[PDB]
């Protein structure tokens, strides 16, 4: 099933530590992407639709640089996807795809990048992704929000202030 | 694999429509939980460890009441889970996520340690749900551009309130 393939992809990405070499991202791609795969991000903007497509060579470096900012976690949520055979492949067309990233210091902001992801799989034993096309339709940066009043009196926060003046 | 069963539970949760009648939750719990089952919440607080358990009878009413606050989406993320007539999945990094709507649109991340026991049947339903709530975050959507504060729509939200003074 192509569905699982993402859950697999998702879970394989949770496997990434802060030491992961360029060889690991290569293995990642060789696991999930065809030797000919292409990944495109589409924005339908004012001046007209802008597309950025990258080749198999930079697909591993693309996922590698998604984590660069001290990011801790990247995963994808597919809601109400569509399966169908088209262009001699299995295709999943999900209108509600959430590309999620998790950040660290200082904001710990969670970024939800949503739109229409259109994935093309081969009908192999491997079932790797031939085409990744993501049409970014929304964008959110969620901020953790102070929950209690006495949190503003934390010595640790006041310590950070002192430390900057030093 | 027991792991899929949650991805299934999750994928089924996106199916909850805005009406989802009490029968709909009846089927849900009957799909994933044994006719026996327990759902437990653990809080390790000052006065000591605090627990809340509900029986198979209340399992649907619990998940049904999870959505009540205008919540739109419920899902669980298992990170680095560990598996081992009882399969147990012991996930130390379990994130229960709910999505809220008007007016704050906050994403709630309730994280902790989830311990699930599944039967060795073809169906593989949950006998024991055990969740130890250890972190909690309320994420807020954040206005990204300056001019968003000058939107006529936000100013209209103001005007619309003054009319019902």
UniProtKB/Swiss-Prot annotation, chain A:
> Would you tell me the Gene Ontology cellular component terms?
cell leading edge; nucleolus; nucleoplasm; nucleus; plasma membrane; transcription regulator complex
Q: Which family does it belong to?
A: Belongs to the LDB family.
Span within the full-length protein is: 27 to 192 of 373
Tissue-level expression reads: Expressed in multiple tissues including heart, brain, liver, kidney, testis, lung and muscle, with expression highest in the brain, trigeminal ganglia, and lung.
Q: What does UniProt say on post-translational modification here? A: Ubiquitinated by RLIM/RNF12, leading to its degradation by the proteasome.
Source organism per entry reads Mus musculus
Transmembrane regions listed in the UniProt entry: none
Quote the subcellular location field of this record.
Nucleus
The protein's job, in short, is: Transcription cofactor. Binds to the LIM domain of a wide variety of LIM domain-containing transcription factors.
* S-S pairs: none
Q: What is its main location?
A: nucleus
UniProt subunit comment: Interacts with LHX9. Interacts with SLK; leading to negatively regulate SLK kinase activity. Interacts with LMO4.
* Protein's UniProt keywords contain Ubl conjugation: yes
Molecular function (Gene Ontology), one example: LIM domain binding
Q: Which GO terms describe its biological process?
A: epithelial structure maintenance; hair follicle development; positive regulation of cellular component biogenesis; positive regulation of transcription by RNA polymerase II; regulation of cell migration; regulation of kinase activity; somatic stem cell population maintenance
Instruction: Give the protein name, as stated in the record.
Output: LIM domain-binding protein 2
Which keywords does UniProt give here? Nucleus, Ubl conjugation
């Amino acid at each position: 099933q192509p569905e699982y393939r993402i859950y697999e992809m998702n879970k394989r990405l949770q496997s990434r530590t802060e030491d992961s070499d360029n060889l690991w991202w290569d293995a990642f791609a060789t696991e999930f992407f065809e030797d000919d795969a292409t990944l495109t991000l589409s924005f339908c903007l004012e001046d007209g639709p802008k597309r950025y497509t990258i080749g198999r060579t930079l697909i591993p470096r693309y996922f590698s640089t998604v984590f660069e900012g001290g990011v801790t976690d990247l995963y994808y949520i597919l809601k109400h996807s569509k399966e169908s055979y088209h262009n001699s492949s299995i295709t999943v067309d999900c209108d509600q795809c959430a590309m999620v990233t998790q950040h660290g210091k200082p904001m710990f902001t969670k970024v939800c990048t949503e739109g229409r992801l259109i994935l093309e799989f081969t009908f192999d034993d491997l079932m790797r992704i031939k085409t990744w096309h993501f049409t970014i339709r929304q964008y959110r940066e969620l901020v953790p929000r102070s929950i209690l009043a006495m949190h503003a009196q934390d010595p640790q926060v006041l310590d950070q202030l002192s430390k900057n003046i030093t």
